[PDB]
Each structure stands twice: as C-alpha cells, then as structure tokens.
Amino acid sequence: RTIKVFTTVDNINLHTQVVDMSMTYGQQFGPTYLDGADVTKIKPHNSHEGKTFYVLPNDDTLRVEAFEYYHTTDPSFLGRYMSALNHTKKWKYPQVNGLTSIKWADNNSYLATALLTLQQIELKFNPPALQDAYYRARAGEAANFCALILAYCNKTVGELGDVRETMSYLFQHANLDSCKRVLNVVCKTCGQQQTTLKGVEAVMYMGTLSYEQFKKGVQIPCTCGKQATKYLVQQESPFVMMSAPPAQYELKHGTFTCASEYTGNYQCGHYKHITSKETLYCIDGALLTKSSEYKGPITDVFYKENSYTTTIKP
Numbered sequence: 001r002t003i004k005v006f007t008t009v010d011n012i013n014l015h016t017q018v019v020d021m022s023m024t025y026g027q028q029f030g031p032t033y034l035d036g037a038d039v040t041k042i043k044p045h046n047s048h049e050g051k052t053f054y055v056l057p058n059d060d061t062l063r064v065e066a067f068e069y070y071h072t073t074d075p076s077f078l079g080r081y082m083s084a085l086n087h088t089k090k091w092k093y094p095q096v097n098g099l100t101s102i103k104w105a106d107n108n109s110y111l112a113t114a115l116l117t118l119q120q121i122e123l124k125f126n127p128p129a130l131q132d133a134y135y136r137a138r139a140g141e142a143a144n145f146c147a148l149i150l151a152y153c154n155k156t157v158g159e160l161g162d163v164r165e166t167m168s169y170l171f172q173h174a175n176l177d178s179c180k181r182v183l184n185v186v187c188k189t190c191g192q193q194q195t196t197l198k199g200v201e202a203v204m205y206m207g208t209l210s211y212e213q214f215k216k217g218v219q220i221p222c223t224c225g226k227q228a229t230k231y232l233v234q235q236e237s238p239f240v241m242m243s244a245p246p247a248q249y250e251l252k253h254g255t256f257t258c259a260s261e262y263t264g265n266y267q268c269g270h271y272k273h274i275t276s277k278e279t280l281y282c283i284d285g286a287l288l289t290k291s292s293e294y295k296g297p298i299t300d301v302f303y304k305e306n307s308y309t310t311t312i313k314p
C-alpha cells in the first residue's frame with residue numbers, strides 16, 4: 001500500500017514522499033511529527049493522505065533549510081519544539097485588553113507575562129521562525145510562538161520559569177546590536193569607571209526598578225571595600241527592562257510601559273502583568289482587573305526609550 005504525504009522542517013518547503021504503509025514513520029523517515037504529536041511508532045493511515053509531517057534534518061538539504069528558518073545547529077531543536085507544540089496547541093490564548101494572553105496551564109504564567117510584554121515593546125526577531133510566529137501570536141495564534149520560546153530557552157512545558165531570564169534568551173535572537181549603553185561607576189577612592197555595552201546587555205539591568213533613579217545614581221559596594229555610585233550616561237535603545245528582586249513597589253500611571261508582578265515564594269510563585277493604558281490594567285492569564293492606583297511585588301518594569309543624554313559631568 002502507498003499514500004502520498006509531505007515532509008518538511010520549516011512548514012514552508014514541503015517534500016512529496018511515498019510511504020510503505022506496512023512500516024512505521026520512524027522506519028522510513030526517522031523521528032517524525034504531525035503538528036507536535038510523535039508518530040514515530042505509528043504506521044501510515046489513510047487519513048494521513050496529503051498531510052504534512054515534520055522530521056529531523058536527516059539529509060543535508062533538510063539541515064540547510066532548518067538552519068535558515070531557526071538559526072541553530074542543535075539537532076534536538078525540532079523534537080523539543082515539537083514536544084512543546086504538542087502542549088501549547090491545546091492552550092487557550094484569549095484577547096485580554098487587546099493583547100494575546102494565555103489561560104494558565106502547565107506553569108505558563110511567566111510565559112503569559114512575557115508574551116504580553118513582547119506585544120508592547122518595539123522589537124524584531126532575526127530567525128524567520130521566530131518573526132513568523134511572533135506575527136501570528138500578535139494576531140492571536142500564539143501556540144507556535146510559545147513552543148518556539150520554550151525550545152529557544154531550553155525550557156519544557158510545566159517547568160517553572162523566570163520572565164527576566166526568558167527575555168534574556170529571546171533578546172539574543174532579536175536585532176538589538178544598534179542598542180548602546182554607557183555607565184560611569186564613580187567610586188570615592190577607586191575612581192570613575194566607564195563601561196560601554198552593545199546588544200542584549202545594553203537594554204537589561206538587574207538591581208532597581210526605577211529608570212529615573214537609575215539616571216540619577218545608585219550605590220553599589222565596590223570591590224575595594226567601600227561604596228560606589230552607579231549611573232547611566234547614554235541610552236540608545238527602543239526600550240529598557242529594569243529588574244529587581246520581587247519587592248513591594250508602587251506603580252504610577254503613565255510612567256512606564258508594562259511591568260511584571262511576582263507573588264509567592266519558592267515553588268509557589270505566580271506572575272501577573274501590569275500595563276499602563278488610559279488607566280492601570282492587571283492581566284492575570286485570562287483574568288483582567290483595572291485600577292487607578294497599584295502597589296505590589298514588582299520584579300520587572302519596562303520603559304520606552306529612544307536616546308538619552310545624562311546631565312552628569314565626567
């Protein structure tokens with residue numbers, strides 16, 4: 001028996017195939033997937049006629065196609081992305097206040113808060129798989145985007161996650177080289193140290209939530225033994241992510257783009273997303289509340305930026 005099916009590694013370039021129906025998909029193709037479901041232990045059915053299957057890049061041509069779409073060499077990427085897709089395709093992606101969210105499942109609260117932020121900051125991905133699925137996620141079809149995020153972060157479904165850490169991985173696949181940050185560490189004895197950062201390191205900071213206070217200056221204990229002052233000199237970026245360990249923080253309307261709230265501790269933590277619109281909106285998975293004032297345990301705050309110049313003399 002024979003049916004005709006298609007094989008692909010990017011869902012773009014399809015390949016016509018003849019399949020012996022007395023064998024399994026793994027026997028003729030190797031590890032094979034149909035929209036996430038592993039069908040390696042499965043033999044062709046008549047219902048599969050004309051359907052498209054993911055495989056692993058066995059030949060070079062599939063490897064050439066796979067690198068262009070995903071920008072990775074990691075041959076495990078397809079199985080991990082397919083394994084993630086098999087779950088994320090079943091998640092619910094409601095529109096909450098005009099943004100694509102995720103109904104909570106499999107400890108995806110950090111994914112929901114990240115996805116919500118990605119929709120409110122200016123950003124473009126370099127791998128086509130990411131940018132294609134990023135576009136579809138903004139349209140409401142976020143299953144493939146979320147599965148790709150897990151594959152690029154080497155995370156699995158159900159595993160707990162950090163939003164700041166998740167952005168870190170994704171910023172490596174965006175085009176942020178144009179971003180530039182300059183910092184002056186002024187230490188009363190060590191001196192006035194300057195650093196220039198390019199790329200992902202130029203938009204992220206771990207220490208405080210306030211961007212104006214980051215412009216004014218923050219003390220950091222120096223490697224000598226005393227205290228040292230830390231402030232921003234030049235910021236050239238579309239946005240800035242300011243992170244701090246979860247602590248009670250007052251979110252003031254119109255002073256930020258969006259923020260990450262983290263309540264709980266250890267294995268009992270949970271993320272909520274706060275965004276600034278005409279008033280303050282709290283998106284918690286598929287749930288939505290609104291208020292004029294907000295105070296909570298914030299761990300990330302995003303701000304808009306273009307070009308900043310400090311008023312501090314070197």
Ligand SMILES: [Ca+2]
Nearest residue numbers: 098099100138
């Ligand atoms: Ca929308």
Ligand SMILES: [Zn+2]
Nearest residue numbers: 187190222224
């Ligand atoms: Zn010092």
